[PDB]
């Protein structure tokens, strides 16, 4: 259940280590994002060499949440770390060529099929 | 709002509430009859009747439970010896409630509570 000011570990290998959520897109007065929703990200801590330098506003997709995701069978998947993959604002599609950690089924929706191919599990 | 919710509070904090019943059990088991307020007496059924049923199976652990509750060897001695065998055929309803007017000093509905025997 990610929202404004929430800090996320980054799943991809783009360059960012910690990224702060600044806004949840897709509808006015929208409180939270989860599962595989789009958020607006600012980068608060980067690695030295990376593709994306510090203090750069860009979009991202949530991949894991501590509160977790429900499936049709009344069954939940909780993680131990809120996390996201970075994206290229108007272009979309991820920056990082490799993705760390698992991702949900409910992320599978055409535009993120690149993430699931590169991701290791689920 | 207390839907399905059991247990009278009696304008007392838990630790106190739990003690006064522990006293009133010891009061009731020894004398075999009490006057108290009608609510207090109604809630006193849920403490005393278990101790009477626990006293049917005369074992050690049951003595140690009947002593964990109550907290008196005398009362434990009046249980098990008398009230264990005296309430055997009777399967429940060991105590009886009888309303006895109003407590003069504060108009509180009084009630006799006593064990079903008196003989």
């Amino acid at each position: 259940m990610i929202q404004e000011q929430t800090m996320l570990n980054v799943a991809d290998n783009s360059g960012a280590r910690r990224v702060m959520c600044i806004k949840v897109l897709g509808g006015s007065h929208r409180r939270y994002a989860g599962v595989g929703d789009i958020i607006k990200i600012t980068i608060k801590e980067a690695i030295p060499r990376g593709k994306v330098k510090k203090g750069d506003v860009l979009k991202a997709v949530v991949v894991r949440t501590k509160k977790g995701v429900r499936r049709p069978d009344g069954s939940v998947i909780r993680f131990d770390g809120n996390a996201c993959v970075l994206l290229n604002n108007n272009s979309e599609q991820p920056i990082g060529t490799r993705i760390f950690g698992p991702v949900t089924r409910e992320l599978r929706s055409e535009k993120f099929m690149k993430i699931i191919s590169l991701a290791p599990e689920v | 709002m207390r839907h399905r919710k059991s247990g009278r509070q009696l304008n007392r904090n838990s630790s106190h509430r739990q003690a006064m019943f522990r006293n009133m059990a010891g009061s009731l088991v020894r004398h075999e009859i009490i006057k108290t307020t009608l609510p207090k007496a109604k809630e006193l059924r849920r403490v005393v009747e278990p101790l009477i049923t626990l006293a049917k199976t005369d074992s050690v652990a049951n003595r140690r439970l009947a002593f964990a509750r109550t907290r008196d060897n005398e009362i434990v001695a009046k249980l098990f010896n008398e009230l264990g065998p005296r309430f055997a055929s009777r399967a429940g309803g060991y105590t009886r409630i009888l309303k006895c007017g109003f407590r003069a000093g504060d108009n509180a509905p009084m009630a006799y509570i006593e064990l079903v025997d008196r003989s």
Binding site: - | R96, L98, K99, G101, E114, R118
Partner: protein, 55 residues
Amino acid sequence: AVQQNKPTRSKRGMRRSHDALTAVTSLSVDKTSGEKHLRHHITADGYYRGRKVIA
């Protein structure tokens, strides 16, 4: 907080109409002793439903 100007005898009457407490009008009669008492309460001597259950 505070009244603008005082109420009357009438209003004060109107309000008190409901304060009139009801009587019992429902006295029992104990089967054996024939003494009067509140329903489901014991008698002052010491009876309830024709059986002595008090010292």
